[PDB]
Each structure stands twice: as structure tokens, then as C-alpha cells.
């Protein structure tokens with residue numbers, strides 16, 4: 001019934017992220033959206049003009065994988081993909097008017113997911129966990145840079 | 148700001164990249180290392196019990212296990228009381244790389260917590276466990 005105190009950090013993070021992928025599917029699956037697509041959408045939303053290959057590098061996924069996810073968003077009309085004028089083989093990405101309209105819907109699902117996850121967490125604990133997460137995300141980025 | 152999930156994805160992503168660098172030469176992935184370690188902790192564990200443990204689909208666990216047995220790290224035997232069931236065991240070869248795998252996991256955590264004190268480190272870990280148990284309920 002209870003969880004092993006054995007599981008390494010990565011395992012627990014995987015469990016948490018696991019439920020988020022499931023939550024996204026159930027809450028936005030009918031809009032033909034997946035966690036990966038949502039990930040790309042938000043990332044592009046926060047940085048219009050970002051290149052497909054840069055998105056590939058950020059998520060550390062291969063070309064085909066990123067292309068397939070980006071292809072579904074474009075098909076849904078949420079993003080537009082254009083050839084980079086300075087390099088015809090690169091693709092500049094942008095969230096469309098339509099895509100910007102669902103961003104809010106996505107943020108609400110994230111908010112609800114977070115409230116559900118921090119059910120047993122006090123206000124102080126939650127803000128502290130978040131603060132710790134940021135510090136660690138910052139460390140992970142340093143690590144990618146170290147190697 | 149960035150959703151919580153974004154921060155956790157970023158963190159978990161460095162672990163995925165780290166395993167590739169440290170164990171890629173063994174064609175091992177995050178999923179494979181995880182299964183391999185769990186089987187090592189629970190010899191004779193059932194394939195379906197492993198899938199229920201990770202909260203992953205039967206098809207996914209199966210593809211991950213095929214990778215491990217193809218590399219010779221694990222062996223599968225039909226469950227003696229249900230031939231449509233498989234029981235898992237780490238092989239001699241698999242047991243040879245476990246220590247290396249454990250050192251790698253340990254080193255990823257130490258790298259991530261380099262600017263964390265022992266206590267913050269313990270707390271963060273405790274909270275993740277709490278959030279994880281909740282995730283299971285949800």
C-alpha cells in the first residue's frame with residue numbers, strides 16, 4: 001500500500017511525471033493533445049521563433065521524434081512551421097492565434113494537477129518544494145553544460 | 148512561471164542524458180536500468196508484478212524486458228503455475244554490471260545535489276516520496 005523508501009530520486013520523479021502524462025491525456029486527450037505535444041506547445045509559446053532543432057536539443061530527443069510531435073500540433077493548427085530564411089534546412093516555430101487560445105486551457109489543467117498533487121502539502125511546504133525544484137532544474141542545466 | 152512539471156522534466160532529463168553517457172555503451176536506457184535494478188532487488192518477480200510496480204503498460208514493460216534479455220542481462224521463465232506468465236531473474240552477466248549501474252545512479256544524484264546541504268537533500272527526497280504516493284492515489 002505504501003511506497004518503498006528504497007526507490008532512487010529518479011524513480012520518484014518518474015512516478016510523479018507518469019501521473020502527469022496520464023492526467024494530460026484524460027483532461028485534454030479529446031483535443032488531440034498529449035503531454036509531449038503540450039510540452040512543445042508551451043515551450044514554443046514562451047519563445048516564438050525557436051527552431052525545431054533547438055527544441056529537439058532542449059528536450060534531448062531525436063529529429064524524427066520531435067518532428068512527429070510538431071507535425072501533430074501543426075495539423076491541429078496550433079503551431080506554424082516555417083523554413084528558416086538563413087538556412088533552408090532549419091525550421092522556425094510559432095504558436096498560432098488558435099494555439100494561443102488553448103494555452104490558457106493547458107495552464108488550468110497544470111494548475112489543477114498541481115493542486116491535486118499537493119493535497120497533503122501545507123502552503124509553506126509547497127512553495128518550498130517548488131523553490132527546491134527550481135534550484136535543482138538549474139543544476140541539471142549546469143550539468144548539461146559541464147558535459 | 149514555468150509549470151512544476153517543466154522543472155521536474157528538466158531534472159529527470161539530465162538523468163536520462165547521464166545514463167546514456169555512462170551506460171550507453173551497454174545499450175542501456177533509463178527504462179532498462181530501472182527494470183534491471185528492480186529485478187535484482189526482487190529475484191523471481193513476475194513480469195506483470197513489475198509492470199504494476201512501475202505503473203506502466205504491459206506492452207512497454209515487455210519491450211523493455213526484451214531489450215535486457217537480448218543483451219543477456221536478464222532471463223525469463225514461464226511461471227510454473229501459469230504459462231502465460233513470466234518470472235524474471237538477473238543473469239550472471241546482469242549481476243556483473245549492477246555495481247556499476249548503482250554507482251552511476253548514485254553519481255547522478257550527487258551531481259544534482261552538489262549545491263544542496265545534506266538536510267535539504269533529505270527533505271527534498273522525503274517530499275518527492277510524499278508527492279509520489281499521492282500520484283498513485285490520483
Ligand SMILES: O=C(O)c1ccccc1O
Pocket residue numbers: 038039042043046149150152153154156157
Ligand atoms: O515539459 C516541459 O519540458 C516544459 C518546459 C518548459 C516550459 C513548460 C514545459 O511544460
Ligand SMILES: O=C(O)c1ccccc1O
Pocket residue numbers: 014177178179181182201203207208211
Ligand atoms: O518510464 C519509465 O520510467 C519506465 C520504467 C520501467 C519500464 C518502462 C518505462 O518506460
Ligand code: NA
Pocket residue numbers: 044045046047048049093094095096
Ligand atoms: Na510562439
Ligand code: NA
Pocket residue numbers: 034036037068069072
Ligand atoms: Na504526441
Ligand code: NA
Pocket residue numbers: 051052053054089090091092
Ligand atoms: Na530546425
Ligand code: NA
Pocket residue numbers: 095096097098
Ligand atoms: Na496565427
Ligand code: NA
Pocket residue numbers: 110111113114150151152153
Ligand atoms: Na505542473
Ligand code: NA
Pocket residue numbers: 176178179210211214
Ligand atoms: Na528501452
